[PDB]
Coordinates of C-alpha atoms in Angstrom, one line a residue:
Chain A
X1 CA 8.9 41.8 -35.0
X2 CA 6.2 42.2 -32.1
X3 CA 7.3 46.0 -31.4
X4 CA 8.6 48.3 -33.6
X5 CA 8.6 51.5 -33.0
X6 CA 8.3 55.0 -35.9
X7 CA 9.7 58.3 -35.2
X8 CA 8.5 61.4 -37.8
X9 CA 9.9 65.4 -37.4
X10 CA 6.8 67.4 -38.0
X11 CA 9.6 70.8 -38.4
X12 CA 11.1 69.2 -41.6
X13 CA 8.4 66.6 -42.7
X14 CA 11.0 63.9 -42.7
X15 CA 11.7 60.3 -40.9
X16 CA 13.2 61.4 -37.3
X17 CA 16.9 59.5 -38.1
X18 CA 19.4 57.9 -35.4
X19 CA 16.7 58.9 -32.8
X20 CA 17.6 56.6 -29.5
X21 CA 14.8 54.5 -28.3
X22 CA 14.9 52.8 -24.7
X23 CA 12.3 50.2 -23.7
X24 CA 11.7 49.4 -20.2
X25 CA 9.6 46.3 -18.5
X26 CA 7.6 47.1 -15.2
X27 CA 9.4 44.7 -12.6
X28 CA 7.5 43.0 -9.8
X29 CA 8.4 45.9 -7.2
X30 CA 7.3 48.7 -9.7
X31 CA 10.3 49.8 -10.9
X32 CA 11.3 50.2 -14.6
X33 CA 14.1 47.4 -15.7
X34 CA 15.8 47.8 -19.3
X35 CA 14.1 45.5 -21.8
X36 CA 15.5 46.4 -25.5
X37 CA 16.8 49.2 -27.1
X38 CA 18.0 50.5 -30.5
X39 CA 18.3 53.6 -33.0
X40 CA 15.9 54.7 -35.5
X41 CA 17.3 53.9 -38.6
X42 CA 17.4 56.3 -42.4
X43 CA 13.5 55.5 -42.4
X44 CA 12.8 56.9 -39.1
X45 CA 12.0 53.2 -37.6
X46 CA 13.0 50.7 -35.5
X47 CA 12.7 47.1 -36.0
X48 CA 14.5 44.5 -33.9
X49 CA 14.0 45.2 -31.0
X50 CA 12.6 42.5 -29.1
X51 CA 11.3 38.8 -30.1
X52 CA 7.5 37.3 -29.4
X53 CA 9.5 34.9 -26.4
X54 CA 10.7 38.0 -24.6
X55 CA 8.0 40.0 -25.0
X56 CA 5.6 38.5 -22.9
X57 CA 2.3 40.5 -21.7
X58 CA 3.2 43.5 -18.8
X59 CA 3.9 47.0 -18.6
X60 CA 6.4 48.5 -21.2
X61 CA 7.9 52.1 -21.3
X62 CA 9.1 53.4 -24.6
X63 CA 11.6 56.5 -24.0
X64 CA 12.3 58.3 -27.4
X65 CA 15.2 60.8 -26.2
X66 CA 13.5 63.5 -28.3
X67 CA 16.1 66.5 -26.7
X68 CA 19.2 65.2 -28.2
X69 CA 17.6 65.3 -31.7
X70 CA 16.4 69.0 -31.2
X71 CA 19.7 70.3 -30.1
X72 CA 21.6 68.0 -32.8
X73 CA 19.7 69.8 -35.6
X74 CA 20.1 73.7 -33.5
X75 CA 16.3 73.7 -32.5
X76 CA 15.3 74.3 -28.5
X77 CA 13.1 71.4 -27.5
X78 CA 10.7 71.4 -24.5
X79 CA 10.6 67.9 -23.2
X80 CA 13.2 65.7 -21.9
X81 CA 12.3 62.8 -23.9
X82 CA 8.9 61.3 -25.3
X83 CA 7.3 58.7 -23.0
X84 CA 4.7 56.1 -24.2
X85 CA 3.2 53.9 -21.3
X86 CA 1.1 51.0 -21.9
X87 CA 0.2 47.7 -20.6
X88 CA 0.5 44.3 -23.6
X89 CA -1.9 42.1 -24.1
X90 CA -2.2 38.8 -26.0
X91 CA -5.1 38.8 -27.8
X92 CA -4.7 37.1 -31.0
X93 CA -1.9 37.4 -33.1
X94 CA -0.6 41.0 -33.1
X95 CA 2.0 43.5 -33.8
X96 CA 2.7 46.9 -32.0
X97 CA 3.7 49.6 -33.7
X98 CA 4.3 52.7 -31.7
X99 CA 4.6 55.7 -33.9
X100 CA 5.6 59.4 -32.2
X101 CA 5.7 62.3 -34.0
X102 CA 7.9 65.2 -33.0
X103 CA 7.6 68.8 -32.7
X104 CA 10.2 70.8 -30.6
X105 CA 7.2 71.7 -27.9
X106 CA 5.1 68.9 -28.9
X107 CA 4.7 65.3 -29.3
X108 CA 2.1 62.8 -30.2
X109 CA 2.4 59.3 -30.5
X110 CA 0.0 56.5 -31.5
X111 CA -0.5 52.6 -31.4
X112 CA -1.0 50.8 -34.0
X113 CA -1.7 47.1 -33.0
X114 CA -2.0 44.8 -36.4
X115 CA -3.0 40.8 -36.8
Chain B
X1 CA -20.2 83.5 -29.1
X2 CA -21.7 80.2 -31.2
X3 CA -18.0 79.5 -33.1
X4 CA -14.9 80.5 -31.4
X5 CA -11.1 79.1 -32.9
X6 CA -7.7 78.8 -30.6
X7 CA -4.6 78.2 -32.4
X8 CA -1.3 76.8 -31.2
X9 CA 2.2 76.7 -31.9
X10 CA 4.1 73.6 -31.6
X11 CA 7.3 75.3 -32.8
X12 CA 8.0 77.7 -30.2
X13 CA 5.6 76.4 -27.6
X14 CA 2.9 79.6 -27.7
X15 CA -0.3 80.7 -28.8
X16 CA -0.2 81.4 -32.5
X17 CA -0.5 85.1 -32.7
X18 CA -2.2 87.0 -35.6
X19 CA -3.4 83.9 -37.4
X20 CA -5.7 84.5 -39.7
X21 CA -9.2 82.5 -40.0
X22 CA -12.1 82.2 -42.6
X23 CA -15.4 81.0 -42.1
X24 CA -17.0 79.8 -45.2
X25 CA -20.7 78.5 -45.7
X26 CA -22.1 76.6 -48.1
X27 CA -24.7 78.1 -50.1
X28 CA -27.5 76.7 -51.9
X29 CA -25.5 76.8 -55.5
X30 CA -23.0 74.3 -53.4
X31 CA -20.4 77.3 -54.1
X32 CA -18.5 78.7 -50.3
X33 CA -20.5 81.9 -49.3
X34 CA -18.1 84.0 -47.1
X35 CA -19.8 84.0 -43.9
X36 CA -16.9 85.9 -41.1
X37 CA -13.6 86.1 -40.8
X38 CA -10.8 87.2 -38.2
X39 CA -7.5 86.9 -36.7
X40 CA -5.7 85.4 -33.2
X41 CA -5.3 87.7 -30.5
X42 CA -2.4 87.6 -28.1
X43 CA -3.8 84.5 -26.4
X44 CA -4.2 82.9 -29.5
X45 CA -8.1 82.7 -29.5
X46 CA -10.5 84.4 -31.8
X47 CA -13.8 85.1 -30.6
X48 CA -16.6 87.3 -32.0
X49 CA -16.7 85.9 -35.5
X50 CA -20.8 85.4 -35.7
X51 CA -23.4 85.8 -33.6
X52 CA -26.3 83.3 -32.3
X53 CA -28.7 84.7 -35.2
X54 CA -26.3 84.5 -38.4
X55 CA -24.5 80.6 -37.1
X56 CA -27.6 79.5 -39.2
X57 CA -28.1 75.7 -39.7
X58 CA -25.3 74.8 -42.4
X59 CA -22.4 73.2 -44.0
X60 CA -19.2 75.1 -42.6
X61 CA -15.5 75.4 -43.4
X62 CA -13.1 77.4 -41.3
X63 CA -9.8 78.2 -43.7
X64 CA -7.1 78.6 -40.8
X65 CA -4.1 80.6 -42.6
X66 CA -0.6 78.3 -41.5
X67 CA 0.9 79.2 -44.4
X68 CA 1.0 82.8 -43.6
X69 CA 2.0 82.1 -40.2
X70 CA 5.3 80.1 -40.9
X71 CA 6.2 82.5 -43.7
X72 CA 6.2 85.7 -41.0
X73 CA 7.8 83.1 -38.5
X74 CA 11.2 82.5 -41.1
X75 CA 10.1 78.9 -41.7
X76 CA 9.1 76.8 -44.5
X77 CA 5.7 75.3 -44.4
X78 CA 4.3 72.4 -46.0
X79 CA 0.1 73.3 -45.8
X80 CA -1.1 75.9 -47.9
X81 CA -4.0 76.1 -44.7
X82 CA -5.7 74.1 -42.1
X83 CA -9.1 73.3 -43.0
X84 CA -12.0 72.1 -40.9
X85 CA -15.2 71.1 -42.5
X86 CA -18.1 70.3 -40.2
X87 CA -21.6 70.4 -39.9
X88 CA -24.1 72.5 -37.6
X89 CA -27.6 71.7 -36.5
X90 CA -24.9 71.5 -29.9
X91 CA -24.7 75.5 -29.3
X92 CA -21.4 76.6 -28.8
X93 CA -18.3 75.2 -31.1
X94 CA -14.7 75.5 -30.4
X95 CA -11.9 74.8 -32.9
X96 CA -9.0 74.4 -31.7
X97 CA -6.3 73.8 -34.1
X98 CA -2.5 72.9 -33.0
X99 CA 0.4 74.3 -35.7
X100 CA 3.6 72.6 -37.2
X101 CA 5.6 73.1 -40.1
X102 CA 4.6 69.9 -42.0
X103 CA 1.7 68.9 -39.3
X104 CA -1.6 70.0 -37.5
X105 CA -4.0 68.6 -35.8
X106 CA -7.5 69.9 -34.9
X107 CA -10.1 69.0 -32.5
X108 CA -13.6 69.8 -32.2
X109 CA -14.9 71.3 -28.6
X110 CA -18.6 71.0 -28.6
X111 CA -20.1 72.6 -25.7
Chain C
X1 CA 0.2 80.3 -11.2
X2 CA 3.2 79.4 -12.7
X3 CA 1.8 75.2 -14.5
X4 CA -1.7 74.8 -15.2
X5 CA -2.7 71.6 -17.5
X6 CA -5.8 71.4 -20.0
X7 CA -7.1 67.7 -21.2
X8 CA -9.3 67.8 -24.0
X9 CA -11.3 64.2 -25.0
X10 CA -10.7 63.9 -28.8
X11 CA -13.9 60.9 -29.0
X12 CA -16.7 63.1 -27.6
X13 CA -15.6 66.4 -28.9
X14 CA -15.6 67.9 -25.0
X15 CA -13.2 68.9 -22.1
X16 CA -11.8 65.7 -19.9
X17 CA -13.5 65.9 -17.2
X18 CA -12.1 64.4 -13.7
X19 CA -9.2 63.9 -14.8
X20 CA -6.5 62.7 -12.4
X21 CA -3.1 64.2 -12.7
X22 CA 0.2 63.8 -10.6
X23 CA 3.5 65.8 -11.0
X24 CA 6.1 64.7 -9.7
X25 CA 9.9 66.0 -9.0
X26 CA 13.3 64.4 -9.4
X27 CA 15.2 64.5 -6.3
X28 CA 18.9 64.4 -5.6
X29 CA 18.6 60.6 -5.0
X30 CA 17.6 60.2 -8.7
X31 CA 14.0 59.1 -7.6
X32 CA 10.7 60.7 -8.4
X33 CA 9.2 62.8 -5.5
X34 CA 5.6 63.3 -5.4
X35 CA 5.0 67.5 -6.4
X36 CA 1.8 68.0 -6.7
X37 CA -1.6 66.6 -7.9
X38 CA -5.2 67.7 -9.0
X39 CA -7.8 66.8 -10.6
X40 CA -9.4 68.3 -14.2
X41 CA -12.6 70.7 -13.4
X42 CA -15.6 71.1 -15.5
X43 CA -13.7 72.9 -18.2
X44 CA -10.8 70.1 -18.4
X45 CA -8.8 72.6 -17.2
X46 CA -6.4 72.0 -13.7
X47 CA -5.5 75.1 -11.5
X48 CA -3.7 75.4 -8.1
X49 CA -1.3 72.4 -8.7
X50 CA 1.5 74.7 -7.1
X51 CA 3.1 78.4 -6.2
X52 CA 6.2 80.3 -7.4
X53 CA 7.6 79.6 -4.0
X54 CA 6.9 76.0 -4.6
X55 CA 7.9 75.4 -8.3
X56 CA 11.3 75.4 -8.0
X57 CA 14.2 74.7 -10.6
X58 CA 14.2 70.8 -11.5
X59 CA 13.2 68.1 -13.7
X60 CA 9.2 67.8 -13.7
X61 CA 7.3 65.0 -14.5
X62 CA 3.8 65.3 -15.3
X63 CA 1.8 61.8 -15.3
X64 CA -2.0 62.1 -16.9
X65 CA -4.7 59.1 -15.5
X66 CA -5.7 58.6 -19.2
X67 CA -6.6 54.7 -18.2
X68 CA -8.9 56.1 -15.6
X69 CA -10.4 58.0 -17.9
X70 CA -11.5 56.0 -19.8
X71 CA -12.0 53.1 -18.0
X72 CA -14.6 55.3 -16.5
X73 CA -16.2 56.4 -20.0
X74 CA -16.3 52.6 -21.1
X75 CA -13.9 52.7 -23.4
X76 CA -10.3 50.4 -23.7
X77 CA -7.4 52.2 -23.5
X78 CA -3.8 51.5 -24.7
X79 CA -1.7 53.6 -22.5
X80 CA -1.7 53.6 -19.1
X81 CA -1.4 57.6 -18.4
X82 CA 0.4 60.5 -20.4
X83 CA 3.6 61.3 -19.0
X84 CA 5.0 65.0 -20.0
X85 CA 8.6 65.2 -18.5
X86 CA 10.8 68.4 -19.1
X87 CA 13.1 70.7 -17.2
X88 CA 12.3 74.2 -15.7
X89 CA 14.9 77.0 -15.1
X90 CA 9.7 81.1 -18.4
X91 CA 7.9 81.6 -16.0
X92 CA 4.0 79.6 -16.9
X93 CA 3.8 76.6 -18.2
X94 CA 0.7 75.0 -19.5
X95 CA 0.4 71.2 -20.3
X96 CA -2.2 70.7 -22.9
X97 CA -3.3 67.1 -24.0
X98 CA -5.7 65.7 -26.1
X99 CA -6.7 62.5 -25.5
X100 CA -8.1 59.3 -27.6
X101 CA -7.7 55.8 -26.7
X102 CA -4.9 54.8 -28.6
X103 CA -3.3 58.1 -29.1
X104 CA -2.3 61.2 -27.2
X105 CA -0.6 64.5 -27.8
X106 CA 1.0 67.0 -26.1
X107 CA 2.1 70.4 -26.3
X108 CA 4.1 72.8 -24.0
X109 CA 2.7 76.6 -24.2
X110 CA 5.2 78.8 -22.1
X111 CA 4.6 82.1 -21.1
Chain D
X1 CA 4.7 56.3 -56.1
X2 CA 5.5 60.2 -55.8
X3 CA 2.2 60.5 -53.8
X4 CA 0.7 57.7 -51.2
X5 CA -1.4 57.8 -48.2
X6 CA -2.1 56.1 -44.9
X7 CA -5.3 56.8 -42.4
X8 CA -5.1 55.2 -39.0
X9 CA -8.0 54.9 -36.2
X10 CA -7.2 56.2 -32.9
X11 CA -10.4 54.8 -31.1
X12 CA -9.4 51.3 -31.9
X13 CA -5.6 51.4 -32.7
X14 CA -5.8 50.3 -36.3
X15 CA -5.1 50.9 -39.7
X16 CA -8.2 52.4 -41.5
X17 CA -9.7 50.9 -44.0
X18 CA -11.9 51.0 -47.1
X19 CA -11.7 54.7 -46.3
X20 CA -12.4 56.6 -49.5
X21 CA -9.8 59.9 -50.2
X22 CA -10.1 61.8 -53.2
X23 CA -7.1 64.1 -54.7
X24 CA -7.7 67.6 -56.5
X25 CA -5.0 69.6 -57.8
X26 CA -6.2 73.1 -58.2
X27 CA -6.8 74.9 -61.8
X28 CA -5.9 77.9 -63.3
X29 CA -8.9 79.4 -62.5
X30 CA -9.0 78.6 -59.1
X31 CA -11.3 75.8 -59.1
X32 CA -10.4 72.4 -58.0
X33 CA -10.8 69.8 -60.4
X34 CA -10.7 66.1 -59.6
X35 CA -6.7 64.8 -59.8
X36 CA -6.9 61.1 -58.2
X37 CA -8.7 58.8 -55.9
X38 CA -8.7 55.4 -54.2
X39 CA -10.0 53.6 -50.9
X40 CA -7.3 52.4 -48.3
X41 CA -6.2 48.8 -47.5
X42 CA -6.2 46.4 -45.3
X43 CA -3.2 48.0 -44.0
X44 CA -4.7 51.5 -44.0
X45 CA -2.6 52.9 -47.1
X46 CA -3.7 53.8 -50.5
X47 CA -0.4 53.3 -52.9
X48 CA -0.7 53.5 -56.6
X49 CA -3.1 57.2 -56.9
X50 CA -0.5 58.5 -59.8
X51 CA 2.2 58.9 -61.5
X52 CA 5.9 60.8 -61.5
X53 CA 4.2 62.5 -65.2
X54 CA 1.0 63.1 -63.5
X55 CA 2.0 64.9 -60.7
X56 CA 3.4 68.0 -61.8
X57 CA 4.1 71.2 -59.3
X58 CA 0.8 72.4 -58.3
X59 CA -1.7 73.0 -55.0
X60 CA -3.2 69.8 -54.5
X61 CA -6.1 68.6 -51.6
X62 CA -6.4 65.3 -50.5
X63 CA -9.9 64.6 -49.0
X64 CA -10.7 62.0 -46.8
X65 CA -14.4 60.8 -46.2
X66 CA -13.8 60.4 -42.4
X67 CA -17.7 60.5 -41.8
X68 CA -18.4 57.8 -44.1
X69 CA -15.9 55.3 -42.1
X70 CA -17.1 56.2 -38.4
X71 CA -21.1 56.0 -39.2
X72 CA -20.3 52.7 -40.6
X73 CA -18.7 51.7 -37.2
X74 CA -21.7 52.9 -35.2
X75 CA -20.0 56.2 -33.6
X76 CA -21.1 59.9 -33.8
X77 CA -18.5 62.0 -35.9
X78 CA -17.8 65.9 -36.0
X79 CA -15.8 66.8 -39.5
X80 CA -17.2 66.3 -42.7
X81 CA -13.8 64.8 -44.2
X82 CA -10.3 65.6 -43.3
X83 CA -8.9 68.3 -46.0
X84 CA -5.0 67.9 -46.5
X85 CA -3.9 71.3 -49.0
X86 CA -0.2 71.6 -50.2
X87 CA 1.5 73.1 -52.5
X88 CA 4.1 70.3 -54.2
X89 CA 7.4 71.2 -55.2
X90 CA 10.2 69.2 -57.5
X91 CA 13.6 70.3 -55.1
X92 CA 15.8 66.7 -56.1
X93 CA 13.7 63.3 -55.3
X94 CA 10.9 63.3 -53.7
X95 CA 8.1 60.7 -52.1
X96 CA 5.1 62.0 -50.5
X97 CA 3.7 60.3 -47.6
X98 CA 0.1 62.2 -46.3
X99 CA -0.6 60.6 -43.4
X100 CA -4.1 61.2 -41.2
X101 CA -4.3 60.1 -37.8
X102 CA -8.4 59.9 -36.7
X103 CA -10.3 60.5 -33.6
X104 CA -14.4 60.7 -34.0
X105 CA -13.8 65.1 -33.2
X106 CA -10.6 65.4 -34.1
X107 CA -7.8 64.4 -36.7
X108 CA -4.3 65.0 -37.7
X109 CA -2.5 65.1 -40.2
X110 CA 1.8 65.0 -41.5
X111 CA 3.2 65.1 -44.1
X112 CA 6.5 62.7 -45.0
X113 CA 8.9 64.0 -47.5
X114 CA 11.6 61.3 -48.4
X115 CA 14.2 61.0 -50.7

C-alpha cells in the first residue's frame, strides 16, 4: 500500500464513510488521466488503491468528492470537491498517506510520507 | 494594538461573530492573572484588548470561548475552548483561530 | 470586489508574501479558462482579481503557487499548489489558506 | 484504549515523535490535576494512556510539549504546547482519537469519536 488515503468530518468528529476518492496521473501533454480509485471504507480510509509497480514517480491528483457527502448528511458545502496536488518521489522506501479533513466550508489535508 | 484575535467559522463559512476571548497572564505564583478580555465584532476580529504599556514581557494564554459559540449556533461541540499559550519578549501578535464542531486550528501572525 | 484571497505562512508565523495565484473558469467545452490572476501583497492579502461584471455564474477554480513559495523560501514542498474549486450563483467570497509544507487548509468566508 | 493520541509534523510530513503530552482531568475545585501521560512513537501515536475504569465523564486537557520537539529540530517555535480541552461523555461505545497536526506557528487539532 504506497497510497492510502484518510478522510475525517470535523462537524461530527467521526471517520468521513463511503466518501469517493479519484486519483489522477499527470499525462505527458498535461492533462489529468485516471489512475485508481475507491471509497472510503467504515474507518474513513482507503487502502488499495494502487500497487508500488504502478505507482511510479509523477504528478498525482487526489479528488475527494467532498459535496456529495455534505448534501448526503443535509449540510450545504462550499467546495466542489477537495483537491490535493503533489509531485512523487522515490526516495527510500516510503508510504503516502494523504489525510483530509472536512468541514462544510473548509478543508485541510496533510501528507504523511512513512519508511 | 500589540495582541489582536480573528475568529472563523468553518461551519457556515463566516466570521465567528460575538466570540468571546480571555487573555490570561501568568503571574509570579505561576497561578493565570486575568490580564483583558473581549468579544468578535461583526468581522470577526477583536482588537483593543491591551495596550503597548500593559502587553508586558510574559507567559500568555488566550481562552477562545467555541463552546459558547456552537451552543448559540444549535450545534454540539466537542472543545470546551480553544487555547493558545505562547510567549512574549516581535511587536504586534495576531491570533487567528479557525472554528469547527470537533476541530480548530490556530495560527500565530507575528508582525 | 466580489473574491479576494488571504495566504498566511504557518512556519514563519507571517503573511505569504508574493504569492502567485490563478483562477480559472470552466467553460462550456468542459475545459478550464484562464479568469483571473494576481499576486499576494505585503499583507498576504490579493485584491483586484476581478469585477461584478466580470464574475459571473460558473464553476471557479482557484490554483495557489504554494511550490513557488516555497521553493523560494528554501524549503521542500509536497504539493504542487492549492487548488480551491467551488461553484458561484453571495455576493464576496474570500479564499483564505494557510500554508505549511506538507499541509494546507482552506476556508471559504462568504459575505 | 478509550483515549489515544497521534501528533504529526507538517514541516517535514511525518509522524511526530518522542513528543511528550500530558492528560489532566479537571477537579472539583476547579484545578487540574495530573490524569495521564506518555511520549509518542515511532509512528507518532501514544496508545495505552488509560483505562475504560479510569476514564470516567469529566473535562479533560491533553497537553502537548510542541516547543520541546521543534527546538530539538533546530527551528524557531511560537506556542508554548498545544492545549486540547473536552468535556468526555459515555453516549453507547466510544474511542477517542485526539489528533494534533503541527506547524512551527500554528497547529490543529480533531477530535475522532468512533464506535
Amino acid at each position: 500500500c504506497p497510497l492510502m488515503v484518510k478522510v475525517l468530518d470535523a462537524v461530527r468528529g467521526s471517520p468521513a464513510i463511503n466518501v469517493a476518492v479519484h486519483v489522477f496521473r499527470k499525462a505527458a501533454d498535461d492533462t489529468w488521466e485516471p489512475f485508481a480509485s475507491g471509497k472510503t471504507s467504515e474507518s474513513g480510509e482507503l487502502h488499495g488503491l494502487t500497487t508500488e509497480e504502478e505507482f511510479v514517480e509523477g504528478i498525482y491528483k487526489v479528488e475527494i468528492d467532498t459535496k456529495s457527502y455534505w448534501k448526503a448528511l443535509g449540510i450545504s458545502p462550499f467546495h466542489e470537491h477537495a483537491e490535493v496536488v503533489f509531485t512523487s518521489n522515490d526516495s527510500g522506501p516510503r508510504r503516502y498517506t494523504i489525510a483530509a479533513l472536512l468541514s462544510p466550508y473548509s478543508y485541510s489535508t496533510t501528507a504523511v510520507v512513512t519508511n
